[PDB]
């Protein structure tokens, strides 16, 4: 079955066949679309998942059906029946990690998928060990501002009782503290985690931009706290090109975005601790982190300084202030020489990547709801692009926050 | 099953049961989501009619009454005899209002119950259609104080006597292909603008020429008509700060009025059912004015603002976008023509959603279409999870007539 996708701004039509290889469910039914919903083993099911993966791997290197291909399948089968699981070769791990990124339908930066530094941390055994691995990842990825995509992969899940987990949602993130008056100091998004850190012993400096400590869980044991070496945490003071009063807002952000709470599934194997990092698209900070009502919420303060007509929404003061803030984020990062991409460039690149993928791969799963930027949506090419969302493995998946499932010792 | 929807900004959770009454398909499957795709017999009729009549009588608190039963029997006998049936005026009004209520892509449904319905089922000719349409335009325009309305022409019979309004909207600007290879006016109407010429219209070759109505009655060939200029309310666009804006020479019409859709009620199909409301600022300022395939005016406006268009990261397109939309709203409001900004419209929709969920058990909504084309996340709907599904009565898309008409 072939599926057509049209770009209503260029009339360019593409054909998707890749979806024929999607195995997982999407959440939608022939009677209801849950496209905007944020989030809708056993010896038996493992080998098939292993085989599917290995066939994909060997096909990619043009060795499908080869003796090397058949021995690997036999080797893995034996291993699974013998140990109930199996270990991936280094090459398969790298291939797996890259494709999980390549298959992430909500990622607009996938044009960079083939360029990913994979750090094999499967020999790690303790939380201190995890900390060392993570520091090395942050330093390598940061590269003094010239950001490089990378991922660190800790030991896969076994009985589900010895999981490795990074309790932080991002390796680097600011603390949030709820005040008794109901207000919040810092980043609202991280209040609950900040509370856990404090409870675990963290001495919170209680400021507006406190880099959180790492809470690391190794081999199913209780998590431990670690402070990332300040010299390893690159930050950018936010100022505006024309508004000299902007800097006085006291804003800044970290340069390295590093998601650390997702699960990496490769050939049936589950890697519960797999922090990965890339670089920021300006709107993530400028629009969401700074202007979401439930985040820093700086629109008013910025608006006032600009002396905009805040009496009636129709003046579009919120929109005006929104643009200036995003100009400030991009300007500051560029001036400090810290990698970043604006939404115009990022979306234009995604379209080229997406078209390339259709011709070489026969498809490119994409989540329109997530691909389209949170500002100036229709002036970016993705808004006008029809997309097809479906799930391919390997892949990155969500998993419940560890504090909701961890059995304390 | 009972599905839940959460707003990630207020944490409010709503439970949806209304979806369990969905009938048509969505185009999606367990393996693939097509949420962003623009467009994914007597034995057949009575079931549909029954479904409709049941909801109608239920809405008037007479479910299972004799009147309910009698009506169901009358229609049943009418279908078996005439292979179709006619709706009572009350059922027609209820149907139209509910087709609007069920339009998952409409952000202004909080206004659903306030719809003036004009019964034009007694119409027989294109001239009659013109008369009905002018009356509709005049009533809805209300000198700038816009009022929602729909005019319903005769329902489809054998498919060979369908009434159709060939225009996509009652009021729209023409588009012509020039020698340069460029396009003059609105590129979106190039094809229609040609069929008008190919039919007789004498195009003024302007940047904003109000297109002539092309009306089709009883399957006959469409006829042209010029909407009395005095009935077409237009707004010149100026900025409340950049006095150079007026020089762009831009203007837009105040009455948005979709005319190419199909209204389906109790199985019956109304191929010509033009309806109107009022504009949300972004529709004109973001989409019609800035879309690359439309008037595509960003660069021009950018220049006059003298901003660095050298690098995309200066966000000149974004800065220029806001101002263009500030102007549209400013103009309309100055001329006292009804119009709503995306902030206000989305806030209303959220309220409507909450009302619908507690009174109806849900509200089908298409997130992709509900979220404005600019400043998406600073509007509440962005943070609102939505469930999309099809309910009848409904407004459906239909093939352009020029691709199906047998001259
Ligand atoms: C080169 C820099 C990259 C850019 C500019 C980029 C940009 C983005 C953005 C803007 C999002 C949506 C984020 C949000 O709204 O919170 C996203 C999501 C995602 N990206 Fe990328 N990305 C990059 C690199 C990567 C890398 C290296 C990986 C994996 C190895 C990756 C995996 C994903 C995944 C799995 C998601 C969805 C996660 C979720 O659902 O929250 N991205 N990316
Ligand atoms: C009172 C003011 C109203 C507002 C502000 C409003 C606004 C909107 C907007 C912004 C859209 C999407 C427009 C686009 O992007 O092309 C829309 C779509 C829609 N509206 Fe409303 N609407 C209003 C009244 C009405 C009325 C009176 C009806 C029906 C009688 C209605 C039926 C629909 C339908 C069926 C769609 C989807 C059409 C499509 O698929 O292209 N709307 N509305
Ligand atoms: C409810 C809705 O799904 C939610 O607000 C989504 C919309 N699109 C998004 N897109 C991106 N990139 N990131 C997000 O967090 C979201 N949130
Ligand atoms: C491809 C994509 O479906 C298309 O560009 C949609 C997106 N959302 C939209 N939303 C509204 N209101 N109107 C539109 O025309 C569109 N176009
Ligand atoms: C970790 C891979 C890079 N992905 C990315 N750019 N963004 C996703 C996480 C960043 C998050 N939106 C934030 O503002 O903090
Ligand atoms: C016809 C009812 C009102 N519907 C509405 N506001 N918009 C839909 C059609 C208008 C179209 N988006 C435009 O900019 O021209
Ligand atoms: Zn779907």
Curated annotation (Swiss-Prot), chain A:
| Binding residues for (6R)-L-erythro-5,6,7,8-tetrahydrobiopterin | 36, 369-370, 383
Q: Biological process (GO) annotations?
A: arginine catabolic process; behavioral response to cocaine; calcium ion transport; cellular response to epinephrine stimulus; cellular response to growth factor stimulus; cellular response to mechanical stimulus; establishment of localization in cell; establishment of protein localization
Location relative to the cell: Cell membrane, Sarcolemma; Cell projection, Dendritic spine
GO molecular function ontology, one term from the record? nitric-oxide synthase activity
Query: What's noted about post-translational modification?
Result: Ubiquitinated; mediated by STUB1/CHIP in the presence of Hsp70 and Hsp40 (in vitro).
Q: In which tissues is it expressed?
A: Isoform N-NOS-1 is expressed in brain and colorectum. Found in the Auerbach's plexus of the enteric nervous system. Isoform PNNOS is expressed in the penis, urethra, prostate, and skeletal muscle, and coexists with the cerebellar nnos in the pelvic plexus, bladder and liver, and is detectable in the cerebellum.
Statement: the UniProt record of this protein carries the keyword Cell membrane: yes
Subunit text: Homodimer. Interacts with DLG4 (via N-terminal tandem pair of PDZ domains); the interaction possibly being prevented by the association between NOS1 and CAPON. Forms a ternary complex with CAPON and RASD1. Forms a ternary complex with CAPON and SYN1. Interacts with ZDHHC23. Interacts with NOSIP; which may impair its synaptic location. Interacts with HTR4. Interacts with SLC6A4. Interacts with VAC14.
Q: Which family does it belong to?
A: Belongs to the NOS family.
Q: What protein name applies here? A: Nitric oxide synthase 1
Task: Identify the taxonomic lineage of the organism of origin.
Answer: Eukaryota, Metazoa, Chordata, Craniata, Vertebrata
Q: Which gene encodes it?
A: Nos1
Query: What part of the full protein is here?
Result: 299 to 717 of 1429
